[PDB]
Structures are given as structure tokens and as C-alpha cells.
Amino acid sequence: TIKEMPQPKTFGELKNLPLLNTDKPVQALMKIADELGEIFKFEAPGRVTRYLSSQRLIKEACDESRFDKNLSQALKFVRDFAGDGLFTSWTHEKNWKKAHNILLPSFSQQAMKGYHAMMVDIAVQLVQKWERLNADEHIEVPEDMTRLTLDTIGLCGFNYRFNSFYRDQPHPFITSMVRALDEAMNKLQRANPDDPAYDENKRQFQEDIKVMNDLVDKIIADRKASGEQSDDLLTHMLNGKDPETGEPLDDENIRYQIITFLIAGHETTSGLLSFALYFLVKNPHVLQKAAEEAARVLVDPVPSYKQVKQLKYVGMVLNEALRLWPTAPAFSLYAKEDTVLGGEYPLEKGDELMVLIPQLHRDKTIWGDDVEEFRPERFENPSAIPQHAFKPFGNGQRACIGQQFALHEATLVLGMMLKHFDFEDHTNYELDIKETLTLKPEGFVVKAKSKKIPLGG
Numbered sequence: 001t002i003k004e005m006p007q008p009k010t011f012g013e014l015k016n017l018p019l020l021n022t023d024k025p026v027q028a029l030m031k032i033a034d035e036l037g038e039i040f041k042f043e044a045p046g047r048v049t050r051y052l053s054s055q056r057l058i059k060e061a062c063d064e065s066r067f068d069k070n071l072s073q074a075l076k077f078v079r080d081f082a083g084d085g086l087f088t089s090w091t092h093e094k095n096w097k098k099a100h101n102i103l104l105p106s107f108s109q110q111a112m113k114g115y116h117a118m119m120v121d122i123a124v125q126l127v128q129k130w131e132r133l134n135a136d137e138h139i140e141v142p143e144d145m146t147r148l149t150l151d152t153i154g155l156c157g158f159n160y161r162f163n164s165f166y167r168d169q170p171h172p173f174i175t176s177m178v179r180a181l182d183e184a185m186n187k188l189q190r191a192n193p194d195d196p197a198y199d200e201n202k203r204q205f206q207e208d209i210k211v212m213n214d215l216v217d218k219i220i221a222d223r224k225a226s227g228e229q230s231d232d233l234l235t236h237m238l239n240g241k242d243p244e245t246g247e248p249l250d251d252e253n254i255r256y257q258i259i260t261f262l263i264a265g266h267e268t269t270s271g272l273l274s275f276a277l278y279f280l281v282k283n284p285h286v287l288q289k290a291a292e293e294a295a296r297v298l299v300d301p302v303p304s305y306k307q308v309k310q311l312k313y314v315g316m317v318l319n320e321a322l323r324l325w326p327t328a329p330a331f332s333l334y335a336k337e338d339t340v341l342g343g344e345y346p347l348e349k350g351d352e353l354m355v356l357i358p359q360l361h362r363d364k365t366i367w368g369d370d371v372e373e374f375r376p377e378r379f380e381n382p383s384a385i386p387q388h389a390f391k392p393f394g395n396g397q398r399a400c401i402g403q404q405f406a407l408h409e410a411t412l413v414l415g416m417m418l419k420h421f422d423f424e425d426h427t428n429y430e431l432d433i434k435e436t437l438t439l440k441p442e443g444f445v446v447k448a449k450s451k452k453i454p455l456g457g
């Protein structure tokens with residue numbers, strides 16, 4: 001029966017936006033959810049959002065007949081350079097359906113067999129980099145895991161080598177990409193956009209978009225003109241036809257899809273690898289069980305596809321790091337028609353709901369009371385986990401098309417790290433989680449000692 005909905009402190013006319021004027025907004029909304037409960041209204045000048053935290057309400061918010069993906073304010077800002085790629089378009093835009101239908105078979109677990117050798121290439125570069133460190137040096141974990149995921153998506157994506165392990169300062173496309181992304185998350189905070197001084201940032205944003213567009217546009221043009229067939233996603237987009245309409249993707253959208261795979265895949269997947277290594281280094285018993293499995297399964301100088309799939313406990317370790325810190329922490333929904341949530345909170349057509357995934361993954365009624373503990377074994381039998389309890393890759397037909405690509409990568413890389421190195425938390429690191437569109441451990445450094453096992457070819 002109809003209930004109330006809390007609201008945090010307001011600052012009249014600015015309403016609750018100062019509560020989000022922090023460098024850590026998701027972790028600040030997790031402190032607010034702890035004191036107000038499973039749903040709360042958050043209001044800013046112009047918008048109203050309700051944040052959901054319990055599986056009880058989120059299983060309802062995940063019914064596709066009543067709710068659909070919303071383009072939140074962050075995604076509308078990202079659409080300026082990601083366009084109508086899969087991530088920043090509405091389900092009912094014609095290009096979302098057409099790209100979804102063409103790309104879906106290329107992102108299956110069976111299609112990972114074709115991208116495997118390209119993922120091993122960048123994985124071996126990372127391992128070889130750490131093999132070659134001298135005994136006085138340490139690893140900057142988030143920074144080499146972002147080198148590893150940029151280069152893997154560049155090479156599986158459009159067969160281009162960004163050669164991030166050969167540089168100190170990134171290839172200028174990556175610099176533009178990070179800076180555009182950065183600019184788009186800063187426009188959220190700036191309650192006074194367009195003009196004062198911002199027009200310098202705004203001028204700069206136009207140039208970063210031009211660098212992205214120009215490099216990708218050229219790759220596509222050179223590709224159609226030479227016509228060689230590789231096993232990257234760009235050839236599957238260039239030769240693919242939507243079975244519903246019979247149409248191909250146009251060249252401008254193919255570009256947006258390539259920019260979208262970079263921006264949607266690089267930080268989420270490297271954040272994941274960083275958090276999994278943290279929790280392993282902080283939990284020696286888990287590390288030993290994971291390192292044992294890697295040494296038993298990965299018996300060849302380079303892992304085969306079938307060997308990565310047998311790395312059952314490494315997969316449980318990554319699932320539990322995604323429970324505790326889902327690297328893309330919230331997604332947004334809008335009500336399709338007037339409806340009631342739970343049987344007690346009235347919603348109107350078009351109201352926005354935001355799923356706060358890190359809180360969902362801390363619901364004591366589903367996970368038990370050791371919710372804050374790192375226990376991979378929670379996932380030993382994955383069918384025993386209630387529907388809509390575990391949502392790190394979103395929901396339904398708008399879930400992460402790249403789910404299988406991210407988990408194969410992460411399992412491959414984590415299995416080879418544990419196989420080849422013993423790790424030491426030489427500084428006794430204290431977790432500080434930096435927020436962008438994504439979450440990562442800021443400053444996590446480790447020392448790796450080699451077990452001197454050959455990494456051949």
C-alpha cells in the first residue's frame with residue numbers, strides 16, 4: 001500500500017545537487033542509500049531520479065515490458081562523440097536494432113575463439129613487460145591494465161596497434177578519447193554550462209572529437225579500398241547485413257561502434273582486473289587456491305581457448321570482484337507507462353530510475369550477512385543465485401554485448417598473471433576508488449616476482 005520515498009537534505013533551488021558535488025559521487029550515493037533505504041528520490045534543477053538498491057525493487061525495474069533503458073545525462077553527453085553507437089542510442093532508434101542484430105553473433109562466447117590469438121598477443125606483451133622489471137621496480141596496476149585493454153580492443157576491433165607498451169605517453173587518439181570522456185563527465189558538475197570560461201574546454205572538446213573521427217574514418221576507408229579480410233570486428237561490420245531490414249551499417253555508424261567499443265570496454269575491463277588483483281593480494285588464501293588452478297590448467301607456454309574456459313575458480317574470483325565493486329556502477333531506466341513499484345511507489349510514464357549496482361550486490365536478504373567479505377565460493381553454483389540479484393552487465397536486450405569478451409580477456413590475463421608471478425603488496429595499499437564513468441583503484445602498486453616459467457612462441 002502506497003508509501004512515502006525519502007529525499008536527502010536539500011539546498012533550496014539547487015535541491016540535492018551539492019550532495020553530488022564530491023569527487024566520489026557513487027560512493028556518496030551508497031552512503032545516502034545506507035541511511036535512506038532501498039529507493040529514494042534525488043532531485044537536481046530540472047531532473048528527478050529515484051535510486052533503487054534492493055533486489056526486491058530492481059527485479060521489478062528489470063521487467064522489459066514496463067521499463068526500458070534511459071539515456072541518462074552522462075550518456076547524452078557521451079553521444080556527442082559516441083553518436084548512435086550501441087551504448088548511447090534508445091532501443092527504438094533504428095540503428096540500435098540494426099547494429100544489435102548484426103553484432104550479436106560476433107560477441108558470442110563461440111566467436112571468442114577467433115579473437116583469442118589476438119587477446120594472447122597483448123597478454124604476452126604485459127607478462128613480458130613484468131618479467132623484465134629489475135628488482136627495485138614495482139607495477140602500477142590500473143595503468144598497465146588500461147594499456148592492456150586499449151590495445152586488445154584496438155587490435156580485436158579494427159586491427160590497429162596502439163603499442164601502449166612501447167610508450168610512456170599514449171598514442172594521441174587515446175589521449176583525445178580520455179580527454180573527451182573527461183570533459184563529458186565534468187559537464188555534469190558544472191551547473192552553469194555553455195559560457196563563462198568553459199568555451200576553452202569546449203573548443204578543446206571539438207578537436208578531440210576530430211582526432212577520434214579522423215583516425216577511425218581513415219581505417220574504414222583504407223579497409224574498403226584494400227578489401228582484406230581479417231578476424232576483427234570491423235570486417236564483421238563491413239560485410240554484415242541486418243537480417244530484419246536487409247540493410248548494412250553505414251560508414252558513419254561503424255565509426256561510432258568502434259569508438260563505442262573503446263570507451264565502453266577499456267575502463268570497465270581494466271578496472272575489473274585491478275580490483276580482482278587487489279582482493280587476491282589482500283586475501284592470501286584465495287590467491288593460493290587461484291594460483292594453484294592456473295598452474296594446473298595453463299600447462300602450455302601460451303593458453304589455448306579451451307584452457308581459459310577450465311579456469312573455473314579464476315572465473316569465480318572475477319565474479320566476486322564484480323559483486324563487490326561493479327566497475328560500471330549504475331544504469332538508468334524510464335517507466336514505459338504509469339505503474340507502481342513494489343505495490344507501493346507510484347511511478348508515471350517517463351520517470352527515471354537509477355539502479356545502484358554496488359548496493360544491489362550488498363543486499364543482506366540475498367547474499368547473507370558476510371556481504372562485505374571477499375568469498376569467491378558464493379559463486380560455486382551460479383544457478384543458486386536468484387534472478388536479478390547479480391547485474392554487473394546491465395539488463396535484458398540492453399545488457400553488455402561485450403560480457404563474454406570482457407570475461408574471456410580477464411580470465412586469460414588473470415590466469416597468466418598467477419601462473420607466472422608471485423605478488424607482494426609491498427606498500428600495504430589502502431583502497432581509494434577513483435570515479436570517472438567507471439570505478440578503479442587509484443594508486444594500486446604491487447611488486448611481482450617471477451617464477452621463471454617460459455612464455456613461448
Ligand code: HEM
Nearest residue numbers: 086087261264265268269272328331393394398400402406
Ligand atoms: C568488466 C566489464 C564490463 C562491465 C562491468 C560492463 C558493463 C556494462 C553495463 C552495465 C552496460 C549497460 C549500460 C546501460 O544499461 O546503460 C553495458 C553495455 C554495453 N557494453 Fe559493457 N561492460 C564491460 C565490458 C564491455 C566490453 C569489453 C565491451 C565492448 C568491447 C562492452 C561494450 C558494451 C556495449 C556496446 C554496450 C551497449 C549494449 C546495448 O545497449 O546494445 N562492455 N556494459
